[PDB]
């Protein structure tokens, strides 16, 4: 009953865990987002066995499923009704997303316009 994508390939992720920064567990001052370890004795940088894995380009996802939502679509961010019609001809491979700033009165009109224009909206329940 939902709008279906055009095709739906099997999406294969080469890795599903995030890359945490080395020693982000040991400290609150170290946040988890990644910094490349530059240090002369670092056993993460030197890639010992049993350590934290470093991100590199080999983990890159298959570029016909890249940026694909887990239900076949790709995401486009919208703010008002008149930039929703750029998805009129991208119907079965891109889905609209009302941005966070758009008020409750105005995202009524985006939802029913996209319903009569066959565009899937990812968050059509946001001030209800």
């Amino acid at each position: 009953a939902a709008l279906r994508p055009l095709v739906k390939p099997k999406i294969v992720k080469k890795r599903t865990k995030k890359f945490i920064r080395h020693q982000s567990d040991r400290y609150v001052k170290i946040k988890r987002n990644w910094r490349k370890p530059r240090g002369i004795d670092n056993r993460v940088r030197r890639r010992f066995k049993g350590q934290i894995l470093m991100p590199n380009i080999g983990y890159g996802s298959n570029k016909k499923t890249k940026h694909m939502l887990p239900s076949g679509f790709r995401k486009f961010l919208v703010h008002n009704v008149k930039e929703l019609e750029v998805l009129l001809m991208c119907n079965k491979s891109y889905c609209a997303e009302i941005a966070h700033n758009v008020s409750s009165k105005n995202r009524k009109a985006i939802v029913e316009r996209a319903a009569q224009l066959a565009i899937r909206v990812t968050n059509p329940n946001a001030r209800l």
Partner: protein
């Protein structure tokens, strides 16, 4: 010239929307709304555009004259087709194929005009 104007508006344009890993374009006579040299409703000597009508019945086919390329008040001639869905498609098909008026935007004008009529059908829950 269409190429010389394209080298200006390729990356710098008010109609150009660049958000997450995809680019769109919002100029009026643009089928597909894609930022492309073939589909651009401003730079070519002859363009095709289709839009919904004044009220929600029909499609407005707008084409571009030969003559007044620097006269924007009179450069476009607008036609409202309000047939059934099958013969409004053979109408747009004849305006492109029989005149040889820009016959690469032909099927893109049919995909848009079919999808613009399905928007006008009464929605069922």
């Amino acid at each position: 010239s269409a190429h010389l104007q394209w080298m200006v508006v390729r990356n710098c344009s008010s109609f150009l929307i660049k958000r997450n890993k995809q680019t769109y374009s919002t100029e009026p006579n643009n089928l597909k709304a894609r930022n492309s040299f073939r589909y651009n409703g401003l730079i070519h000597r002859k363009t095709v555009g289709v839009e919904p009508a004044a009220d929600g019945k029909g499609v407005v086919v707008v084409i571009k004259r030969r003559s007044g390329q620097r006269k924007p008040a009179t450069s476009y001639v607008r036609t409202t087709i309000n047939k059934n869905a099958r013969a409004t498609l053979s109408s747009i098909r004849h305006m492109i194929r029989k005149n040889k008026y820009r016959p690469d935007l032909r099927m893109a004008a049919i995909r848009r005009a079919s999808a613009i009529l399905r928007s006008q059908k009464p929605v069922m829950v």
